[PDB]
Every structure is written in C-alpha cells, then in structure tokens.
Symmetry: C2
Subunit: 245 residues, 2 copies
Amino acid sequence: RKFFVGGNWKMNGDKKSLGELIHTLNGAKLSADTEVVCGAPSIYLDFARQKLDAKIGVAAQNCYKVPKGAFTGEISPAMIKDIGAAWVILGNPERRHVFGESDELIGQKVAHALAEGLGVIACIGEKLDEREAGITEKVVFEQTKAIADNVKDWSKVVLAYEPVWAIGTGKTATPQQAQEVHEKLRGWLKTHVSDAVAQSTRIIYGGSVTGGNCKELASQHDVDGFLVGGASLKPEFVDIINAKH
Amino acid sequence: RKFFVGGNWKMNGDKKSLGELIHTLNGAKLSADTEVVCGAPSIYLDFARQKLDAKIGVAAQNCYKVPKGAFTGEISPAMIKDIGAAWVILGNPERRHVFGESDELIGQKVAHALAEGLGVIACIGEKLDEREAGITEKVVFEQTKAIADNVKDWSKVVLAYEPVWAIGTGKTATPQQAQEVHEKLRGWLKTHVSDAVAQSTRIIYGGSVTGGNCKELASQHDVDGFLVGGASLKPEFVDIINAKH
C-alpha cells in the first residue's frame, strides 16, 4: 500500500498565503513513495490545481449527490472534475457533527462521487463519550458499513480514521490506539468485502498529527498515512509527507 | 431605489457553458439603470469575476459566520472578498429547508458578512402550508426580524422575498400577491427600523421569474427587482434585467 498523506486546509487561506504554501510544496524534497493530496477551500480549488505541481493531487472538501440542480451553495463531482481535482473528502467530522450530515447522505454522496470517477477519502470516527463507553468498534463499523455498502470499486477509496476528540485538541491518539482501530477496520474489510480489498485499501489516521509525532504513528503496521489538519498549513507538512524516512 | 436583478446560477454550469453565458451578458445591452449581480457556484467565483465586465457584480451563494477555522466545506467573507466578489446570498430557501439552516444561524452570517464589508441579498419566504394556513405575514416578519436584528447598516442590504412554493415550480406569485407582501415588508421596516430605511431598501421578488412574467411584476410599486434562478442561465436573463425598458 502506497503511503498516503492528505492535507485538509479546512476554512483557511487566501491567495497570498496559499500561494506561498504551494510554492514551498512545489520546491520541497518530497518522498518519491508518497501520494499527496491537498484539500482546498472550494473557492480556491481552481487556483490550487493551477499552481500545484501535477504530482500533487487536489481534493474538494465536500460535494453533493447529483450532477446539477437547485442546490444553492453546493458543488457537484462534475464541477470538481471540470477544474481538474481528482478527490473529494467526504464524511469529515465537522460535516457530521457541526453541519448535521447523516450516514445515509454521506453514503449517497460516496456512490455519486465514485460514479463520476472521483477518488474518495471517506472519513469515520467516534466521539469521546462513545470511546469511554467502550463502543468505538460498533460506531466505526456502523459508519464504515454505510460507506462500504455504496462502494462498488474500492480502488479509488481511502478510509480515514479520525477520532473526534483528537481533532484540533492536541490530543493525538497514541500509536497503540491508532493501530488498534486500523487493524480492527482492516479485519472488517476482509470479512465483509474481501481479503484483496482489505490488503489494498489505505486506512489513514488524522487528529492532531504533527511533524513531531508522525514517525511513531507511521511505523504502526496498519497506519498507511495521515489526514493532516492544522499542520498542513505549515512547512512541517513536508516532514509529515516524509514521515517514513 | 435602483432596480436590482440578481441571477442565482445555483449548482449549474461548468467553465465551457458559464463562459458562454458570461460572453452573452458582456455583449448584451443591459439597462444602465439596473444593478445586476450573478451568483456563481463557489468553485467558479474567481473565474466569473475575471470574465465578467466590471459593471456586473459577483455574489457568492453562501458563506459561514467566521473568518477562518476548522469548518471543512465552508467559505468565509474574507475569501469571497479576496476573489473580488462584492455580495453574498444568505437565507436562500434551499439552505433553510433542504440544509436546515436556522434563522439564528442566518442572522449570524448576515452580521458577519456586513462587518466584513460585503453586500447581503437576504432571502425570506413562506412555504405553501403557511400560505394556505394564512400565516404569511407572521412567517416573513419573523424571518425579517432575525435579519434586521443583525443589521447595523442597511445601505448594503437587499431583501429578497421568495415564496417557497414559487421556487423552481413554475408557479409564479401574481403581481398582486408579491405587491401585497413587499408593501407589508416595507411598512414593517418603517415601524421597526426607520422611514429612511423603509424608503431606500430594495425589496426584490424571486420565484419562477421569466422573460414572459417580468414586466407585469416589475410595474408593481414596491417590487424593486428580481432574484432569478432557472432563467438566469438563459438568454432571457437579459430581458429580465431590461424589464422596465
């Protein structure tokens, strides 16, 4: 499995500051072996695909579930492809817990994005109350089944485990905590889809990944990369891409 | 009050077809007494502001209530302004009824977009059940108060009355239906804000406006223009801009 690190810029940047971040990425010494994609604000997706080196992929941060229509404020897979982006982030925890996107809606958006030929980074993760009650497995298998039941071709899917308690809080999961759920999710994939899908699907981790903690997390056997939030706006993102070196 | 018509492209277009729409608008003879603004998909805002003649305004179809942060999928007023767009549509019926945005959230978005120096097209409107129940006045005054509580300077605000039953259905409000609530809205503003604000605020109608419709609606005394959806993607958008000529 090719190591994968995605950078989600979230609602951050303007053209001057994302211009200099992109200039750094294009000039950096990036691992020949890592697949990198940057998740840009929708208003800057065209700019970011025009400015980033072709080797780095561009991801939309959300999309809707039909190609066109009376959905003010939404963008579709067809428009993302039009600009030249190749990925979309779906199911991100702010979209679930701030904006109220349900598992049934995220499942419909995955099926549509994939039918349009986009790659999908599908996000899953439990909240702290659920972790402390001992039901992390149940919650991530329920969210993963709602995505998987809508995936026909797994070659374009990357699973991203992001515990909600670790996003923006500095409370990174330990290598042992990350590895536990990544192994459990890989086992669900082998049992419910197939063994070939379980060994080829990248399952990445996000939630307070920094250049400081990424090598310990990257050496775990079922962690295939990272979905970087806050640190993807900094030069240390280059150290995270290179976390296997 | 300068006659205002806004086109809301909603989730439609790609660069090939929107560039053609733009070329038509730039080439058309549009009345110099109409203020016109096009509401492009967020992915095409930068493209639209670059290709449109400077006399035509650009509006974002939605924004969030803070400058930056962990809100994947959202854009802020600072980003809209960075692209050079001058307006944002807020409170649109799809955002309220399909995406669940509340009066409280829309009010917070109005106050933040105006603070940031953007013009706001604030939409209000009742659903069919409320109109049949006879509570139109109760519903839109309630929504208007939510916006008004958050407006300090009305010179950058345009109220858009769009009955939900008239959006995308083909069922246009009659000239007399529209005039009756525009007039009640302008009186509400007179008693609750000031006579000067009631006199100078543009109240536009939206909901299945066409080239065929527009002249009789525009001749009503309190209808100051249009928010156009489906017909903003067509050549007849020019006739609607030119409705008083």
